[PDB]
Symmetry: C4
Subunit: 356 residues, 4 copies
């Protein structure tokens, strides 16, 4: 065969975690983790850098709950600075797991593009905790040059770069000096990249390959995109990602940007790809414009997502994420296994808060 097929790649729906002997209840497990080599999270969730997901309200709530929000970059420098500053002056025992810097202020992230040094300058002055250098194709000279230039001017600024989906890409970014890599080419709910360009790696195999390489450098992996249910968070972490970035599951909350609207008797919010026409008009598109149901507060969403993670860790018998990653074992399943895993042969009559 002329064509080079390197592996058969799996994603979340193709695998399940095996139960393990457990001496710990879900409410007892520890779910803190690392965002970067130098920044910890108290809970492993990050809200996506998207203009229908994270501005200051979402970033504040995510940090209060122990995680992180990344302010999107589809705004001018001054507006983004204003958003970072609003998170940073936000700060109450209602939030005992709040993720704070050494001064007691909430952590926040902010996204940047290739070559946007003036923006990096402004965000550093505004007190940003981590810069997220994002591009459709992180394994690129433009990205690596920007990494090198930022770490040369701000040696102690935590820098996350992405997105990537190969071991070669993880090595290249780790060698350029990043503090974490963000993995995900194509898995996003609103993403058409794989369909429009033919490029991508199914998300489980992409995490697995990139974690194996990035661990050789001590660099955490953020699993970005494709999370549909709380069970997918556990699988992403068990394969070895240090944290998970989520868009669609948070787009429908009070705190995300944009107003509620009603369609056919039910309430929704807009949710769209940053590579969709609408977002780019604020080169051919790699995302769509859509809607997601309204699901209330980020707090109630996060409670269900982490409840599922805790249940998963109790089933596996892990006391914390490190132990979860060391001892998780998987089985590969079939299409019929997946059908068996969902609800089947019964008509759901009541909504469940964690299953749609």
């Amino acid at each position: 065969n002329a064509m080079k097929i390197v592996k058969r790649a799996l994603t979340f729906e193709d695998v399940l975690l095996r139960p393990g002997y457990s001496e710990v209840l879900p409410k007892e497990v520890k779910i803190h983790t690392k965002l970067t080599k130098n920044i910890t999270l108290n809970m492993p969730l990050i809200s996506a850098a998207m203009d229908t997901v994270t501005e200051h309200r979402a970033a504040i709530m995510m940090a209060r709950l122990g995680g992180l929000g990344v302010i999107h970059k589809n705004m001018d420098i001054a507006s983004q600075v204003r958003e970072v500053k609003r998170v940073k002056k936000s700060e109450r025992k209602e939030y005992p797991d709040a993720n704070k810097d050494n001064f007691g202020r909430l952590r926040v992230g902010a996204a940047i593009g290739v070559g946007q040094m003036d923006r990096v300058d402004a965000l550093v002055e505004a007190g940003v905790d981590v810069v997220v250098l994002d591009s459709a194709h992180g394994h690129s000279k433009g990205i690596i040059d920007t990494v090198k230039a930022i770490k040369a001017k701000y040696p102690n600024l935590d820098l996350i770069a992405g997105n990537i989906a190969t071991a070669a890409a993880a090595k290249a970014l780790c060698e350029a000096g990043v503090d974490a890599v963000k993995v995900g080419i194509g898995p996003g709910s609103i993403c058409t990249t794989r369909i429009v360009s033919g490029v991508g790696v199914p998300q489980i195999s992409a995490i697995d390959e990139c974690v194996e390489e990035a661990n050789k450098f001590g660099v955490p992996v953020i699993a970005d995109g494709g999370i549909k249910y709380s069970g997918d968070i556990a699988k992403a972490l068990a394969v070895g990602a240090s944290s998970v970035m989520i868009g669609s599951l948070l787009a429908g909350t009070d705190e995300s940007p944009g107003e509620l609207f009603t369609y056919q008797g039910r309430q929704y919010k807009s949710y769209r790809g940053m590579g969709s026409l609408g977002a780019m008009q604020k080169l051919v598109p790699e995302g769509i414009e859509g809607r997601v149901p309204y699901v209330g507060s980020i707090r109630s969403v996060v409670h269900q997502l982490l409840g599922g993670l805790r249940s998963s860790m109790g089933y596996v018998g892990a006391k914390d994420i490190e132990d979860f990653q060391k001892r998780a074992e998987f089985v590969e399943i079939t299409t019929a296994g997946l059908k068996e895993s969902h609800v089947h042969d019964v008509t759901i009559t009541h909504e469940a808060p964690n299953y749609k």
Copy 2:
């Protein structure tokens, strides 16, 4: 370097090969072991769910030769009453104790020794120790406490889905292990937590280990059609536990209701919000009304008899020794169902 230990299969992935047969479906024998010490005349058990089994369903299961497990979503006195109703019902296939009284089971959870005490005094035949995660310190310590206090009480524990878990429960002294993490029709465990094992591979793995102890395996959850029962027993389960196929019956708890011109009964997971009243592991639903348990069980056991006839098996143990499987594809599964023809008459065993 992720640890995938196995490609795991479930019911729809496999079929039984026919073998040379000298037996007609009429003639095969379908008795089996529930526990090390209790035999069933038919290998079907109704699920311990508050939309499936109270006394009326348990009575009919035992009269037909199997067993009902009274659910534990009720206080102790209520469950004792349900047990006494079944034992008091009477005193050719009926599953009876040494006094001519129907046999019945009853579910308990961890740290419920007072419920065990009352159920034993009420004459329960078997206690079913029921957890979302059987392979845990709480369950193992509860098994050891029950067997130390009641050496001669048959104890079933679950649920599990690995060889290591079957070993642990068998070493602690259970009389049967119940296998099934995630296969249930109303179950969302695998979606909410990412954990589970497709039911065929889980039975296969647990049987191999439990056989070392002479301990039967109960295949719990995921049975959709009667062929699923045949497959589970052929792989080596000694009995099968069924929820959804029995919940739309006259005998299950709860009332008929009508929706869009046709009748239903509620059916819900014991880890759904409704049953527990939180991060649920089940949903609340409805199933079509299908008449009496008698007519359902007749169809289910009819399928099992046909299967044993096709395989040439005189009885369950011979069925397990003779069974050979093929793995099939999605195209093979579509070929197996009805295809390319519009069904006009609802068929008593295929829906």
Copy 3:
């Protein structure tokens, strides 16, 4: 430690690779063998079902060059009457010039009478005797489970009593079963446990073998005895006929594609301003009212005459043989190379991304 023999494939899992061809579809030969002793001029048999084959359908199947098998869900006198109607439709001494010009490929016995088959069950020796006396050309011994003592004993009794009667027996799905029936003296084995459109056996009993692998395994054993294999059930499209024959079947038995025709028994009816005929498994409750059912009761769209259906089915086979370069069915089996496909490959193979606005005569 559960014993999985193999991964088994059915029609939609495979495709034939094109091969170098020097023949056009109108030039290929499609005659074949029904049994060791009976030839067909085309490779199609209508199912022994009370919604498919009674005398009218059997007369048409024979005129077109194949065979019809009269079902057995009737008393002996009624099945004799059906067989005689086929045997008396035509004869060597009656020069029906119309029928002889329209149907030049008609499949006839040595007296110039249309051939016909008839179904029997285990131990129905009285029915066999009456069918022989009626002039039946081949007896089809049907059971849900051909690989059984009851069937093998029936085969040995029939072959002892009528050594020259061609006898088909089924249904089977393993090589061991084919070996057992061939050693017992059958003239052809009929393969298919579970593939039928109206069949629920695999779902109700968990027992079956996907049809391509089942044919493949039984052909390899039956060929050792010179015994033809009949692929019975699960044919959805003309391409499935080609695949079945290419894998090694000598003929194919079809139910649902022939049930909605003028010639099948049963009356046209209308559902929501559309015409249908009934089509039901012989193991359905309706058919058995005459233990738990192994089929359903259904309807299929009315499609006109058996002639236009068969014309399309054989046109697809001829095309297939042209693509392989096969001059005849045995050449087809010796040339044929398959590929295994995926789910996406099956999607690609069907019509996709286009709304169909006209009925194609061979694609529904």
Copy 4:
């Protein structure tokens, strides 16, 4: 036992892996070979179908850098007339179409389909100035095709000749040895095609391209991947596998330029789209049973807007792979095989689409 040669994959079974890139999508080169002797500025060819390509579609495809193939479901004189219209096709146009695919005289290039043994048709198309003849059969790997290739190359040594369709390495070898200038690969993948269902014959398109490219490269002969392209990503996969150009039917059938009528049905505009082996197409020509259907596709506007989106997807793909040009694309490309769940992850999922996207239906 039966002989299964391999497990065959098509477009939805595979994805391209990203590679290290120093190039942006607007900088990559998408020039490619049509035959041994003719190049395209862009690798797209409109299908030789009577609902896709007559002179108007061929003019636009050539103006955008590719090619149109005039279908053969018409008499010789009608097909000569369509070819002449393209060849007869002001100085502003040269500004607006700076990538036009022209012959030596500055006329738009055009192809035309012929059938087995149709030497009279070849003679008339050559005198009309056709740039390439596409010898097309349902079954290219046949004595009839092979003898016609030989007779055409004997009589017109300098006429570029594409032959198809094929799906195996043995077939590419036979056509290359008989002297074709490109082979066209595709048995069964077409949107409107029922060949694999009617006859059971075919090879999933990715494996078919891959097998034919390996053999045809030994003769320096380009492969045209014909059929089954649903999205722009499929074009990228086909080229990365080793195809030199891609032939497109359904994605161009609902354009202004395709022949046949815009009509409205239930508030939406469509155009007819049908297989050349459908009953309607063959009754036009007027015996073999059909190997295609008759349908309709939504109206999508101009060919230019469609082509812009398709090539934008190709450029993006080459940027992800790090490829500066098509040959570099093919050398660098590495694939993964995916599952049905992988394909579901790849599409839009768990969100309702509320706005039209120009490259994703």
